[PDB]
Design a protein around this ligand. Sequence first.
Ligand code: NA
Length: 224
Amino acid sequence: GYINAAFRSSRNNEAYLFINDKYVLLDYAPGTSNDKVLYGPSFVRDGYKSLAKTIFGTYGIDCSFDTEYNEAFIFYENFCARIDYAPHSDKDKIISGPKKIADMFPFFKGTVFENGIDAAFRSTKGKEVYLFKGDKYARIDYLTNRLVQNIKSISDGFPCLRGTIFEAGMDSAFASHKTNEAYLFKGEYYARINFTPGSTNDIMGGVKKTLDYWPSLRGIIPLE
Ligand code: NA
């Protein structure tokens, strides 16, 4: 029972983490030791009343990403939705969906991403987003609803993850609040990377046991 989906919050140094059919709010503090759970662990149906009577409320969220403002895309199997998550409030809503992925992001029809996406994080370049399913990754523009490039292996786009357990799959991801950085999660292992849009940039090697560096997740992962 580990991290399944994350998206960066619009509130500085904060992130939402989705585990099983549950979620937590966290001050993941990249520049500090002072890490901490802000809200939860709660059920998605309880925390997000907008999602209470949906498949997400029943099953949780297996992939998500920050777009802009207080908005983020959330997925579960072949369906997905845009919602406003309303940081620290009641006032959270469904904006778009729930649609199938192939109706939200048409270009995905015919590919591995059509029946489900593993994880995803917001790129620093414009309205761009990187997504992961299996051992391939996509580069999209959610605003113009197009694929910026052909879908290639994580090994090809991200050379730093070669020879790491992250080479054949990522369970969860989110972008840091710091420039060109994102976190990746697979099982009990995590890594902080420094990504440059449109490059074969290596670094880093920092594959660490998640509980070792996230003090405030002991008791939550592994969620039994
Ligand atoms: Na996932």
